[PDB]
Amino acid sequence: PSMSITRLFPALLECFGIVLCGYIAGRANVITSTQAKGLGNFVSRFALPALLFKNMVVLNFSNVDWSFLYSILIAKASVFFIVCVLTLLVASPDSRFSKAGLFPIFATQSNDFALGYPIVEALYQTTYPEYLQYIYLVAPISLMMLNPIGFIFCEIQKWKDTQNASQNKIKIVGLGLLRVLQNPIVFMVFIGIAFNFILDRKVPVYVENFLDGLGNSFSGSALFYLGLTMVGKIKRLKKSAFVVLILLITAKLLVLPLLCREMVELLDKGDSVVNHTSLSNYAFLYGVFPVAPGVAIFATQFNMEVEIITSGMVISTFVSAPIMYVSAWLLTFP
Amino acid sequence: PSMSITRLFPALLECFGIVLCGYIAGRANVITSTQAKGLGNFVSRFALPALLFKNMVVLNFSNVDWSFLYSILIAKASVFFIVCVLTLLVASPDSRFSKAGLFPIFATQSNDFALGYPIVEALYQTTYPEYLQYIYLVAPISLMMLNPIGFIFCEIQKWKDTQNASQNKIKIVGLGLLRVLQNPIVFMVFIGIAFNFILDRKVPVYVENFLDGLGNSFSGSALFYLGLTMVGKIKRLKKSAFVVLILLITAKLLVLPLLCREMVELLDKGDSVVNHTSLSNYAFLYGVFPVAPGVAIFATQFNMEVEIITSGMVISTFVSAPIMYVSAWLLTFP
Numbered sequence A, B: 001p002s003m004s005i006t007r008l009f010p011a012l013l014e015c016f017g018i019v020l021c022g023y024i025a026g027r028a029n030v031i032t033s034t035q036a037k038g039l040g041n042f043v044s045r046f047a048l049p050a051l052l053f054k055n056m057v058v059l060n061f062s063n064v065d066w067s068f069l070y071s072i073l074i075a076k077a078s079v080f081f082i083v084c085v086l087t088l089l090v091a092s093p094d095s096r097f098s099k100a101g102l103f104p105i106f107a108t109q110s111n112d113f114a115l116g117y118p119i120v121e122a123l124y125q126t127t128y129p130e131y132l133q134y135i136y137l138v139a140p141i142s143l144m145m146l147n148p149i150g151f152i153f154c155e156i157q158k159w160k161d162t163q164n165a166s167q168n169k170i171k172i173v174g175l176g177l178l179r180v181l182q183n184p185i186v187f188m189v190f191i192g193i194a195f196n197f198i199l200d201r202k203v204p205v206y207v208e209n210f211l212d213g214l215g216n217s218f219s220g221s222a223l224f225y226l227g228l229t230m231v232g233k234i235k236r237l238k239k240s241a242f243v244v245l246i247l248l249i250t251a252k253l254l255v256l257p258l259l260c261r262e263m264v265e266l267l268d269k270g271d272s273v274v275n276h277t278s279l280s281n282y283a284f285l286y287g288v289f290p291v292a293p294g295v296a297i298f299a300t301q302f303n304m305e306v307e308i309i310t311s312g313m314v315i316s317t318f319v320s321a322p323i324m325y326v327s328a329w330l331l332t333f334p
């Protein structure tokens, strides 16, 4: 098979075993809540930017199958649009733009670097190594295109909090794009593109070892920090909250993969049936990825719903592992 | 040359650039002192034991050049003995045993995993890959032989701090060995040897990914933590304190490499002049390695000299980089 089903279980074992190590360390107070920030800061501000820069300068932008990127972008945009309109119609007038901003983000952007990358690395290294670069192209552009709309919706909600005649339409759009630019992923991707043009895709050997050393520690540290941040997050809550969680996680893990697959079918025109099928199966896998903790960080930053997002973030992690195993097994069975 | 001098400067750039990143993060309060413990716990309690286990189970104890190992431990023991007797003769009656316990440990135990391993990996990968395993054999055995004596001396100092007729010599030896056993580098090495025999040097593929994901995040994170703990450490001491610092750092970085080279000259019979020369150059390099932060941790645990060991630990790092560069150039010029 194009995707190695036999290597899928060891990769899942690695990822959720590091997550379990972090979870047990937090539960036993080996690493406390305050001490968790140091690992979080290192992995998000040093380990992730170095990896992003190294994978952005090296990337051959000319030899990129933009059809996969367009298909996944339109699938995510369609899911964003559907979730936004449904929430705006059904949510309580008190807070609709908050949900219509964060819920579509919850259901579209996923754990692509910490957890998504190891799975793609395991399944798509000896067959399709090009599939690894789409992790570093889909996610930054997804945060650069859909996240501005959600942040604008959250700023609109904050504006209803401070009711006034001054709409501040320019400021509302200004704040929404500013938060996207402030995120390390986006501006490190911009700098990586810049230095891909300046350095002509050749990172100097004087900084090669430094970049590898700072970027080879991301995967394990990010998985450990993910496990460490799940301590005391899943709490009992109302059954209306439970059903909206079920709908959101379903939209993320079944609806989003199916939509990604169908727009890949519509957009990707490949000479071979085999490579098109494998790319559609990858697009199915991209979406089985659980909700990124960045969504929880955004919810904490805006402080609008830090229980609906965080709980669904942790739960989708425990649902993604069975679904990804079941899906690929069902996708390698024929 | 046997060692790649052209690759030495990029390795130093990587190591001390991650150290500089950690230092600047600590100086700018990006990662605070309390937050640093979370990264410290991740490397010492999770990242280092996984790497030690993976490198202990895989290691083939049969194909090991014990001559280098014997030479280096005999050199470190000779330096330990010399420093111990000199300190016992010259130090003030008040704290002879504390200095005679920690100063010989300062001048023999070096940073072999965080800092030593990347350098040896850079200079001894395409030529002498066997040189990397000695890092994981010298350091544990050095910690299991010389460190017990130093801990016994510190327990003697603590005993005279609690002067009583019951010298409890059995307890003094018991605590000295117990501290070594409690160290992860020791009991993880024992477990790795045990599973090297049980698993016949074959780690299961199920846990290979987990171990290689938790152990590939050590070097960068450990260098970052070394830089992070360096903030606010170098402080002005007295002239006597400065001269004992100079003597200790010289014993560590010039005397110890020279003695190691001598024991390699004597206790090593090699078919080729070239391999013996390269291995003696390695033994010179081992000793140019700065004082391990574990020595400072031991000093903090015993709380006798937390300003003499720690300052010399930081200073030896900034002296090891010029010395290793100069020494490798001087060892590759002929």
Ligand SMILES: CCCCCCCCCCCCCCCCCC(=O)OC[C@H](COP(=O)([O-])OCC(O)COP(=O)([O-])OC[C@@H](COC(=O)CCCCCCCCCCCCCCCCC)OC(=O)CCCCCCCCCCCCCCCCC)OC(=O)CCCCCCCCCCCCCCCCC
Pocket (backbone or CB within 6 Å): A041, A044, A045, A046, A049, A050, A053, A181, A182, A184, A187, A190, A191, A193, A194, A206, A207, A210, B013, B014, B017, B018, B020, B021, B022, B024, B025, B028, B029, B030, B031
């Ligand atoms: C071999 C030896 C070499 C190695 C030697 C050592 C290496 C250098 C070490 C220096 C740093 C070490 C210690 C860090 C602290 C010191 C200062 C600092 O960085 O503060 C960060 C500061 C720490 O404070 P904090 O309170 O903990 O964090 C708050 C956050 O900023 C939360 O955000 P906020 O709300 O507070 O917003 C503020 C933030 C928001 O950020 C901004 O506003 C800046 C970005 C805005 C947009 C920029 C895009 C520009 C586009 C250009 C063209 C693109 C084309 C497309 C155009 C777009 C059209 C669509 O701006 C800041 O003030 C912080 C960022 C500083 C400027 C960022 C840009 C450069 C830094 C990135 C690293 C180097 C890049 C390569 C440079 C090569 C030549 C020097 O914030 C961050 O951590 C920022 C996020 C991550 C950035 C990097 C941080 C450390 C960098 C070192 C490791 C990364 C690897 C480097 C890659 C390649 C380098 C070779």
Ligand SMILES: CCCCCCCCCCCCCCCCCC(=O)OC[C@H](COP(=O)([O-])OCC(O)COP(=O)([O-])OC[C@@H](COC(=O)CCCCCCCCCCCCCCCCC)OC(=O)CCCCCCCCCCCCCCCCC)OC(=O)CCCCCCCCCCCCCCCCC
Pocket (backbone or CB within 6 Å): A013, A014, A017, A018, A020, A021, A022, A024, A025, A028, A029, A030, A031, B044, B045, B046, B049, B050, B053, B181, B182, B184, B187, B190, B191, B193, B194, B206, B207, B210
């Ligand atoms: C693919 C999926 C698979 C992955 C799934 C998840 C993996 C498992 C995760 C479990 C742990 C996650 C969260 C950690 C916290 C939970 C409990 C815990 O471990 O607490 C540690 C506990 C945390 O508390 P703390 O207050 O922050 O630290 C205090 C320190 O212990 C400071 O020392 P102290 O003064 O407080 O002394 C107390 C310490 C002192 O330690 C002792 O007294 C124990 C050692 C004494 C001597 C043992 C030598 C035995 C020699 C046998 C034969 C050798 C032949 C030669 C004979 C000698 C003759 C010369 O004893 C303890 O209570 C702590 C150590 C616990 C037992 C250590 C032995 C086993 C654990 C090591 C990892 C697994 C090994 C492979 C096992 C394979 C089958 C299960 O301390 C440590 O961190 C200990 C140091 C490092 C040990 C490992 C810690 C986490 C292990 C997970 C990552 C390591 C990689 C595993 C390698 C291979 C595994 C496949």
Ligand SMILES: CCCCCCCCCCCCCCCCCC(=O)OC[C@H](COP(=O)(O)OCCN)OC(=O)CCCCCCCCCCCCCCCCC
Pocket (backbone or CB within 6 Å): A012, A013, A014, A015, A016, A017, A019, A020, A023, A024, A027, A028, A029, A318
């Ligand atoms: C049910 C499905 C999930 C679990 C699958 C099976 C897990 C087996 C774990 C075996 C680990 C052996 C290590 C020692 C564990 C026992 C001692 C310990 O530290 O307890 C862990 C914790 C209780 O901690 P506590 O008792 O508060 O503090 C410790 C001192 N008493 O006890 C716990 O709460 C352990 C964690 C259980 C729930 C974890 C859910 C999130 C973890 C990430 C996803 C699942 C990853 C694990 C499964 C896949 C493995 C790759």
Ligand SMILES: CCCCCCCCCCCCCCCCCC(=O)OC[C@H](COP(=O)(O)OCCN)OC(=O)CCCCCCCCCCCCCCCCC
Pocket (backbone or CB within 6 Å): A061, A062, A064, A065, A066, A067, A068, A073, A141, A144, A145, A193
């Ligand atoms: C509008 C709302 C937001 C939508 C965002 C959609 C993604 C935008 C990303 C930036 C632009 C990427 C596309 C630029 C190429 C020109 C248009 C195109 O798609 O042509 C692709 C062409 C290959 O020919 P074709 O058959 O068309 O492609 C089939 C795909 N396998 O290939 C080429 O012509 C390649 C030539 C250019 C190669 C270097 C490109 C570097 C600059 C892009 C870096 C990333 C910037 C991201 C910005 C996104 C902003 C939202």
Ligand SMILES: CCCCCCCCCCCCCCCCCC(=O)OC[C@H](COP(=O)(O)OCCN)OC(=O)CCCCCCCCCCCCCCCCC
Pocket (backbone or CB within 6 Å): A082, A083, A085, A086, A087, A089, A090, A091, A092, A099, A103, A240, A243, A244, A247, A248, A251, A255
């Ligand atoms: C173009 C017009 C199209 C119109 C279509 C017809 C109407 C919609 C039919 C399909 C509905 C699908 C989603 C069902 C959502 C149910 C939510 C729920 O049970 O809680 C909502 C409730 C708010 O109050 P409610 O009971 O809705 O009272 C009426 C409001 N005036 O509880 C609350 O207070 C919580 C509010 C939060 C609601 C969040 C909604 C999230 C939606 C997730 C959708 C997932 C994907 C669905 C689409 C799949 C196919 C692409």
Ligand SMILES: CCCCCCCCCCCCCCCCCC(=O)OC[C@H](COP(=O)(O)OCCN)OC(=O)CCCCCCCCCCCCCCCCC
Pocket (backbone or CB within 6 Å): B012, B013, B014, B015, B016, B017, B018, B019, B020, B023, B024, B027, B028, B029, B318
């Ligand atoms: C003199 C020899 C050592 C230094 C060699 C040259 C270092 C050049 C550094 C360039 C780094 C550029 C990044 C931005 C630095 C300027 C802004 C900053 O954050 O300052 C760093 C620090 C002052 O921090 P502070 O001002 O308190 O807080 C920041 C906000 N004002 O300023 C400092 O104190 C910086 C650290 C200087 C001393 C570091 C000594 C230990 C570092 C590890 C060993 C040396 C590693 C560097 C050399 C080799 C590089 C691989």
Ligand SMILES: CCCCCCCCCCCCCCCCCC(=O)OC[C@H](COP(=O)(O)OCCN)OC(=O)CCCCCCCCCCCCCCCCC
Pocket (backbone or CB within 6 Å): B061, B062, B064, B065, B066, B067, B068, B073, B141, B144, B145, B193
């Ligand atoms: C006195 C104070 C303590 C001194 C400590 C010094 C280091 C001790 C480390 C453990 C024992 C290692 C030596 C065991 C081998 C028997 C003696 C020996 O050195 O023989 C080496 C022999 C090769 O033949 P030869 O020519 O003698 O070696 C030349 C070196 N290139 O090769 C062989 O015979 C190899 C056969 C055995 C291979 C498996 C060994 C596994 C067990 C050791 C694991 C490490 C345990 C460390 C314990 C240290 C305790 C302080």
Ligand SMILES: CCCCCCCCCCCCCCCCCC(=O)OC[C@H](COP(=O)(O)OCCN)OC(=O)CCCCCCCCCCCCCCCCC
Pocket (backbone or CB within 6 Å): B082, B083, B086, B087, B090, B091, B092, B099, B103, B238, B240, B241, B244, B247, B248, B251, B255
């Ligand atoms: C069999 C007989 C052999 C006789 C050989 C010759 C005798 C030795 C001659 C040289 C002596 C050098 C002494 C260096 C220290 C000078 C200060 C001193 O002696 O005072 C004792 C000092 C007092 O304590 P202190 O805290 O410094 O002062 C009180 C106020 N703060 O105490 C201290 O705290 C400092 C004690 C010094 C600790 C370090 C000593 C060893 C340093 C490494 C030496 C490496 C090179 C040795 C030769 C290698 C050969 C292979």
